[PDB]
């Protein structure tokens, strides 16, 4: 990877970039014919939001997602991991990938509510004041429809709407 350091010496600023250590993909993928990191390791349909060991490889130090052109993921898998990372952040499973705060900023205390499988952003959702009849019930989404094809070990399929 490449870093950038800004140093001000004698009323003069010097901008430089250095190449740091870069991690390498593990040798001998079980499926060399695979076209992306996911299918090269037979991971398609076999990872979830809480698989941070997988998810953490495709995000930036501050929690941002990495471009698809750099990681090599396909559009389908890149979108699945994108949703998985949002749910991982909301679940509190990435405590060392928090947003960068400018000097002098200390967030004010906010109510702590444990949550998981959170599709939407908390602030953008309204209460369900009118539930509606049984034949037209307003449902609360749980999980993501992108993961509908994940391997199901139970006879009941994933319920995405509660």
């Amino acid at each position: 990877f490449r870093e950038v350091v800004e140093t001000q010496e004698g009323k003069t600023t010097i901008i430089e970039g250095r190449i740091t250590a870069t991690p390498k993909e593990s040798p001998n993928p079980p499926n060399p014919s695979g076209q992306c990191p996911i299918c090269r390791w037979n991971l398609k349909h076999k990872y979830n939001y809480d698989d941070v060991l997988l998810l953490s490889q495709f995000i930036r130090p501050h929690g941002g997602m990495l471009p698809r052109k750099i990681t090599g993921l396909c559009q389908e898998e890149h979108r699945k991991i994108e949703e998985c990372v949002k749910m991982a952040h909301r679940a509190g499973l990435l405590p060392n990938h928090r947003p960068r705060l400018p000097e002098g900023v200390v967030p004010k205390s906010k109510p702590q509510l444990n949550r998981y499988l959170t599709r939407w952003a908390p602030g953008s959702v309204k209460p369900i004041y009118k539930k509606g009849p049984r034949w037209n019930r307003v449902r609360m989404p749980v999980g993501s429809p992108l993961l509908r094809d994940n391997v199901c070990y139970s006879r009941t399929p994933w319920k995405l709407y509660h």
């Binding site: 079980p30 037979n42 991971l43 997988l54």
Partner: peptide, 8 residues
């Protein structure tokens, strides 16, 4: 050290 069907 990974078989053809190995999955992490």
């Amino acid at each position: 050290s990974y078989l053809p069907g190995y999955v992490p």
